């Protein structure tokens, strides 16, 4: 199934792109929300950018664990990798949305 | 310990206060953005009611190995409720962010 | 974009099905893990089934809030609905996996 | 309150103990299922190290409105660490479940 089905493969790649675009939108909107509540507060935007950088490193480290049993480059590996990236990105997007609403 | 017991109870209270604040601020955000949109307040209220039912059902699963009415069960129950509440608060804060 | 693109629409529906199948697998495996650690403990499997039932009700209630600004039946609504179902299902699957590992 | 301060600190300790247990049990599950698979223990260790760096970076964002070194900042810091730890523990428990 995942080892051979074109739509499973194509949609895993496609949904990773959608999840990444939605995360970028969430990040961009958090910056604007934080600026609305706090102005360009000293260190704030740099701290948000630094955290997001470390997050992207974690995302990749965790996806290397989650996909450890799959063969790099295989259909199954790409689907697993892409699903992991999408899910992790969705969860990060939710977290960034939640931060803008801390009053 | 009296202290494990007291802190588990206190931290549940704190988590529920923050959840209530997240809920109230969501309602205000939604009204700000969408006004008296038909059904909107009612959908949010209904969802949160079902959530509290899930919270108790999941906590009954998580505490299954403890003896109900025991101090240990109550610590475990409070800890589960607190964590579930924190997760729900994050989710409500994430809603109506556009 | 989401209002008109076929692949966005098709992959949102497809990934909802994948997420639901993965959740069912996680649920089925939790039952087996709980049985391995505790046997058919009085009330345990019924409590797990009851919780999952309420969860499915919550999933739908929450997705009705998340999609409130979209028009029922529209491309945008279906994509939003399906993405919400998929994300909620992924998060539930992770939670059920985590429960089997509570020692 | 001395009690808010003490419970926030205590609950951080509890959350970190449960996270360490989740981490240790994950390692045991992984060894049970995959043996000395090349790179596997090292990948899990490396990921958890990066996670602790993210935890501190995100907590610095969450506590940005408080004065560092203040009792209020430390309560807020401990609460953030505890919740982040609980979330990580759930995630590690979810790994190697097949």
**Which residue numbers of A have CB closer than 8 Å to B's CBs?**
26, 29, 33, 94-95, 97-103
Q: Are the beta carbons of D50 and A57 closer than 8 angstroms?
A: yes
DSSP string of A18-85?
HHHHHHHHHHHHHHHHHHHHH-S-TTHHHHHHHHHHHHHHHHHHHHHHHTTTSPTTSHHHHHHHHHHH
* DSSP at B11: H
Report the residue of chain C nearest A22, measured CA to CA. C83
d(C-alpha A28, C-alpha A8), whole Å: 30
Find chain D residues with C-beta within 8 A of B7's C-beta.
6-7, 10-11
Q: Which of C22, C25, C99, C101 to mutate to test the interface with D (most CBs of D within 10 A)?
A: C101
Class level of CATH domain B1-98: mainly alpha
Q: Are the beta carbons of A84 and A66 closer than 8 angstroms?
A: yes
Which structural technique was applied? X-ray
User: How many residues are given for chain D?
Assistant: 98
CB atoms under 10 Å from CB of C71, counted, come to 9
Among D21, D94, D98, the residue with its CB nearest the CB of C98 is: D94
Q: Across chain B, which distance is largest between two alpha carbons, in Å?
A: 51
d(C-alpha C20, C-alpha C16), whole Å: 6
Q: Are the beta carbons of B48 and C65 closer than 8 angstroms?
A: no
**A22 is written with which tokens?**
């939605």
d(C-alpha A102, C-alpha D63), whole Å: 11
**Chain C partners (3+ C-beta pairs within 8 A):** A, B, D
Q: How far is A41 from chain C (nearest CA, A)?
A: 31
Q: Where are the domains of chain A?
A: 1-103
Report the residue of chain C nearest B34, measured CA to CA. C69
Q: How far is B25 from chain A (nearest CA, A)?
A: 8
**Which residue, among B97, A76, A95, has the nearest Cα to D61 in the 3D structure?**
A95
Give every CB contact of residue C45 below 8 A, 6+ residues apart in sequence: C31, C34, C35
What number of H helices and E strands is found in chain D?
Answer: 3, 0
Among B11, B79, B86, the residue with its CB nearest the CB of D7 is: B11
Q: How far is CA D34 from CA A7, C25, C32, D29, D63, in A?
A: 30, 21, 20, 8, 40
d(C-alpha B88, C-alpha D16), whole Å: 21
Kindly report the CATH number that applies to the domain delimited by C1-103. Answer: 1.20.1270.180
| Sign of the C-alpha dihedral computed for residues C64, C65, C71 and C75 taken in this order | negative
Q: How far is B51 from chain A (nearest CA, A)?
A: 18
CA atoms within 13 A on the CB side of D51: 20
CA atoms within 13 A on the CB side of A61: 20
**Which residue, among D96, D43, C90, C83, has the nearest Cα to A83 in the 3D structure?**
C90
């Amino acid at each position: 199934n995942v080892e051979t089905d074109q739509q499973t493969f194509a949609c895993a790649a496609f949904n990773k792109q959608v999840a990444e675009r939605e995360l970028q939108s969430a990040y961009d909107e958090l910056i604007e929300r934080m600026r609305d509540q706090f102005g360009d507060e000293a260190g704030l935007m740099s701290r948000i950018e630094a955290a997001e950088k470390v997050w992207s490193q974690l995302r990749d480290a965790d996806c290397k664990v989650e996909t450890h049993a799959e063969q790099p480059g295989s259909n199954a590996y790409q689907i697993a990798w892409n699903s992991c990236i999408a899910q992790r990105s969705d969860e990060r997007a939710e977290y960034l949305r939640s931060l803008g609403s801390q009053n």
